[PDB]
Amino acid sequence: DRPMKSMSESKCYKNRQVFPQDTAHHHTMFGGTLMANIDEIAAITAMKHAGAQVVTASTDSVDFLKPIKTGDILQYVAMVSYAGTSSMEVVVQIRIDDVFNNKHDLAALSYLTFVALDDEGKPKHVPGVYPEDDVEKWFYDTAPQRVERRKARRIESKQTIEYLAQA
Amino acid sequence: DRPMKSMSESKCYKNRQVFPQDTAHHHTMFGGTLMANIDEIAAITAMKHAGAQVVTASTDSVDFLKPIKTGDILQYVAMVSYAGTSSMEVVVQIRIDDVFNNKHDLAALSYLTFVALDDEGKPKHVPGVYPEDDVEKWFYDTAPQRVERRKARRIESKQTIEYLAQA
Amino acid sequence: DRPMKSMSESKCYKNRQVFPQDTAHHHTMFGGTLMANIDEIAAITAMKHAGAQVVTASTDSVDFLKPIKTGDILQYVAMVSYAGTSSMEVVVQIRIDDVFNNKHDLAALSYLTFVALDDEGKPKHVPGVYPEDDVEKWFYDTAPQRVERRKARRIESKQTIEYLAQA
Amino acid sequence: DRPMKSMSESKCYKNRQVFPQDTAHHHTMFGGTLMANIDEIAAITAMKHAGAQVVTASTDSVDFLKPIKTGDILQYVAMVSYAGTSSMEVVVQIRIDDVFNNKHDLAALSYLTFVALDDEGKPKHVPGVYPEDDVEKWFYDTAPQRVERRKARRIESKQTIEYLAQA
Amino acid sequence: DRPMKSMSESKCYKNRQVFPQDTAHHHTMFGGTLMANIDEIAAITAMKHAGAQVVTASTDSVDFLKPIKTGDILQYVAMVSYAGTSSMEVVVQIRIDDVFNNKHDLAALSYLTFVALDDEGKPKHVPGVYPEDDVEKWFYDTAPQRVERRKARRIESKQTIEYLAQA
Amino acid sequence: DRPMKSMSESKCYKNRQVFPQDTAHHHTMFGGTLMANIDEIAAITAMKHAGAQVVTASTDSVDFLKPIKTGDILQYVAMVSYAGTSSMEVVVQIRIDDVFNNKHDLAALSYLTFVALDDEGKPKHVPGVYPEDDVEKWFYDTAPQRVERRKARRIESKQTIEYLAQA
């Protein structure tokens, strides 16, 4: 069918320290700030893959696994793990890069769905995607099921939207 | 069993305009900024309900329904729609308050899970919750199923975490 | 004479925690940041009442009653307490919402004057205003005198402006 | 009686451009941001005069005279125009510095009251103050009356505070 | 030859405290934030001298001499120390203003090069410059040599740019 | 002599879009903001190489080659190109990643000098460094000379510091 890109072509890195202005509780990163950064680097990966402007259609999930403290170096790695017609699933891995002991613990994991757009603001078709290394293979292989679950959630979500519209 | 609070006791409002610094694309609110604000007001609702410090354990979903433009007044309403043992599901409704025509369209909808903590940082039990009005009843009545789906997602999520730990 | 709105129609809430980036002295909210937020929520209330774009014409006063510490949940309540021809007096109450003991102490109190504007930037007439509950009645009943004092201050202010223009 | 400082000893300048993040309406500075900066430079002047840490006790007034547009260079000049026992009246002049035609129009004028504090956080006595040039003389000569009016406002303010405490 | 301005005509002051959001390490100002502020006040001085919009062409150096701690009052003084055809060397002095002991230690020193631009974005000629006081004389007298060294650095820099373009 | 690290071990990437809050002139990135980000990613590279906390000792140069517009994706690549005893030269390349035509033009180039520190804040020895690929070889091979020129600049800089101390 369509043109294809490697998951490695859109793979994007971001390294960023945690500063006091990123925190809420004493020396601890606030979840909202983390979500902002996740969305930033995911948006960049989706832009590279689509070769276009994108918007966040939904945050499918953010799993906050570890507390993140002031001073911590965060490594964000985003990649496109699934391509629908005009939509992309972007998976973001966030690791704490401890330079004192070379550990790189997974601190958070997130899935977002982006939609590519043309210059007049309507959905635009995106290249397909294929893995190369084993990790890419893992996200690529587990994507279909996540996509279907997102489908069901969108059904229930639409019920809720319709209910709130009558009040 | 336990002490109970009304969903109305923890119900929190936030009104905030969209300023240029909130935008990415021309005059359009960036998704990350919206997620930061969602997490802020949800955290406040969870604090009121728990009577304690909280952290975001996970973002279960953010559904971005409408574009939000510079100048728009956003109304955030957070409430606790489900109480586990020490965890809370907070549902946030975000509406655009058009003061020129009194429309209040739902622009986004989000579910987050917070965990209450005591002063030494371990999970703390939270009061139960009950609805009063019809909307509260809706979120209260649809919560159990969302909770179970979150359970399954956490299973798959744990598989992914274990896979990434061997690479 | 003119169309009238209830003070409850424009009444606006804002809930927001104090984060480290809001502070100057150790764990203490900086006055400038508080004034920014006061102006934000007051602007929103004036927009709802006027059904129009507004600008801050003057800050009539900010009374800082209590120190506000990092972590504190602030509740801002703005309402229109007086309607001139095209101007509005907005009164903002700022309370600390202590979720550990359900106290809600008044931390600051502020009066601002907004002017409503049409799309080409000139002053626009605003609906009149009436109270319902007792608090609204209090601000409504004490407004005329504040308005007159603001009149005198504007006279002296004009003397100062004219003096500075010759130097 | 006490030690005295010249108004010129505490006189402080601040020059700062208006950037998009300072604006609300299209290319127009938001009042809250201006108030933050006013409070910043006023705090610095009060610190120099008192030789101590200070807090903002009240904003006595902000008069917004001109619209301020993106790109504008603002010149803030703060000085101490009155010294009570442990309190200071700081007057801030804000001018637009047009480098294209060397005009320096007064865009805003503000009076704030600061209280000096020692290291354990209680009010601390401040040096007295005297003018030299004509402008300083003007603010010094018009201060007593402003002080008395602030006294009356504080009386009414206390009535309002006591009324709100019973609701 | 051309019209001339005094170094005192473009001389600009900025006073600004260090707030927690300015820090990276515990209570210590982050270098990037300092560089942002340096560039801000230098840009303003270059605008006054050129009577035009400017852009930063290069940072010739920032020398960080002292640690700067939270709470510190920084005094920035920028001036034009050299005028090329359409370019300006701006020298910025940053001092810590200790109000407790009236010391004013030099905390940093920086040289930047700005280019003046007309309304369609091309380089525009700038007035020449002359000193009056001794400090101005010092920077004016040491400028030619810095200019020549910048010339050599720009040669090597161009070699590096050309090398990177082939990879 | 000492332990050695590859330039590739400390090599760090950062991808970040330009948002309106990053701009000064209409849709154009402000130099100060760019310098903040440069310092951020350079600090991270120096931390990885040193295995320690670092501070910016000096910005040796920032060369601004292209205008950077709102929406642009910036790719920052930092690496250690020279190791003194306890100091590091970090070179940062900033490229615009045009996803519409796959160009990656060098928009800026910068050299900074960091000093590694132990937990009580004094300079700490750093591993040596060696290149692998051709680009790394280029910066490694051109470093000694830059180091010597920095030595001379530090001599003149010290003259200026001593002169300013007598005024």
Ligand SMILES: CC(C)(COP(=O)(O)OP(=O)(O)OC[C@H]1O[C@@H](n2cnc3c(N)ncnc32)[C@H](O)[C@@H]1OP(=O)(O)O)[C@@H](O)C(=O)NCCC(=O)NCCS
């Ligand atoms: C995202 C948006 C353009 C979707 O367009 P639409 O009008 O609904 O029309 P479509 O359904 O054809 O969109 C095309 C794709 O978006 C997907 N999509 C739309 N909403 C989605 C959601 N909530 N979750 C997952 N996918 C979604 C669709 O499934 C479709 O995918 P496909 O190409 O594989 O078929 C629209 O909902 C929107 O503008 N949302 C606001 C986005 C935003 O501004 N976010 C930041 C706000 S702060």
Ligand SMILES: CC(C)(COP(=O)(O)OP(=O)(O)OC[C@H]1O[C@@H](n2cnc3c(N)ncnc32)[C@H](O)[C@@H]1OP(=O)(O)O)[C@@H](O)C(=O)NCCC(=O)NCCS
């Ligand atoms: C949230 C956290 C304290 C959970 O504690 P824990 O060590 O896993 O132990 P527990 O499982 O007993 O936590 C208690 C509750 O948290 C829930 N929980 C933990 N992780 C969860 C997740 N990813 N999604 C939903 N619920 C979760 C548990 O289900 C449990 O709920 P219950 O009271 O109904 O039984 C821990 O995972 C953590 O600290 N996460 C980081 C939180 C954070 O800092 N977020 C912002 C980072 S930027």
Ligand SMILES: CC(C)(COP(=O)(O)OP(=O)(O)OC[C@H]1O[C@@H](n2cnc3c(N)ncnc32)[C@H](O)[C@@H]1OP(=O)(O)O)[C@@H](O)C(=O)NCCC(=O)NCCS
């Ligand atoms: C506010 C502004 C539009 C007033 O308009 P104007 O040219 O002075 O003409 P008017 O006097 O007829 O304004 C109409 C109303 O504004 C009121 N007004 C103007 N300045 C005022 C002041 N300093 N304090 C209180 N009210 C004021 C007038 O009293 C009048 O009220 P009314 O409808 O009850 O009669 C004008 O002064 C302005 O633009 N100020 C700058 C506002 C701003 O940009 N603030 C943020 C800057 S960072």
Ligand SMILES: CC(C)(COP(=O)(O)OP(=O)(O)OC[C@H]1O[C@@H](n2cnc3c(N)ncnc32)[C@H](O)[C@@H]1OP(=O)(O)O)[C@@H](O)C(=O)NCCC(=O)NCCS
């Ligand atoms: C400012 C504060 C220390 C006043 O102290 P206090 O407990 O009221 O005791 P005092 O009245 O003796 O204060 C001493 C001086 O402050 C003045 N003061 C207090 N409140 C004032 C007000 N609202 N307006 C003007 N002056 C005020 C007093 O008049 C007095 O002046 P004087 O030396 O000339 O006699 C106290 O009200 C406070 O902490 N306010 C909060 C300040 C703050 O944190 N602002 C930023 C919050 S975001």
Ligand SMILES: CC(C)(COP(=O)(O)OP(=O)(O)OC[C@H]1O[C@@H](n2cnc3c(N)ncnc32)[C@H](O)[C@@H]1OP(=O)(O)O)[C@@H](O)C(=O)NCCC(=O)NCCS
């Ligand atoms: C600054 C800029 C306009 C220079 O223009 P140009 O196309 O190179 O043409 P010119 O060489 O004639 O520029 C005129 C002057 O700029 C000087 N200049 C250009 N680059 C310079 C550099 N890297 N260092 C020092 N001076 C420089 C030139 O020496 C010249 O000085 P002169 O008037 O004394 O002869 C161009 O390089 C540019 O746009 N840079 C990006 C600026 C920017 O946006 N900075 C913030 C980015 S975040």
Ligand SMILES: CC(C)(COP(=O)(O)OP(=O)(O)OC[C@H]1O[C@@H](n2cnc3c(N)ncnc32)[C@H](O)[C@@H]1OP(=O)(O)O)[C@@H](O)C(=O)NCCC(=O)NCCS
């Ligand atoms: C950086 C600092 C620790 C240097 O320490 P010091 O007291 O001068 O003692 P040293 O000279 O032995 O420092 C050790 C190394 O730093 C280098 N150094 C110090 N100042 C330097 C400068 N201005 N430029 C380049 N290198 C410098 C020294 O050359 C030395 O390098 P080496 O290991 O190859 O011999 C000290 O100057 C400082 O604290 N500066 C402020 C740093 C800062 O806070 N920046 C952000 C402020 S907003």
